[PDB]
Design a protein around this nucleic acid. Structure first.
Length: 51
RNA sequence: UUUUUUUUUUUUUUUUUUUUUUUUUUCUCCUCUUUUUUUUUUUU
């Protein structure tokens, strides 16, 4: 769902940032919805202030 | 629920020269009448 796919995004991005496999590549099969994925999350902040 | 790839505005430059206005034709050709020729001279 529109609000449930975000749940999937914040589920996979939760049980993987704790462990060492934080670098992740998502092979989206559409040039259009690829930007839609990043647009509707808006909060990961996976960067240190030094980086 | 629609991915991936398909180049672009020709290369060249560090060659010598010791002439001179013009330019080139036109043929022989019946002159009508008072004359010898007047004359010094002086006032500029």
């Amino acid at each position: 769902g529109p609000a449930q796919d975000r749940g999937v995004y914040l589920s996979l991005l939760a049980s993987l940032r704790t462990r060492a496999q934080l670098p992740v590549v998502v092979f989206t099969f559409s040039r259009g919805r690829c930007d839609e994925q990043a647009s509707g999350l808006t909060s990961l902040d996976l960067t240190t202030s030094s980086e």
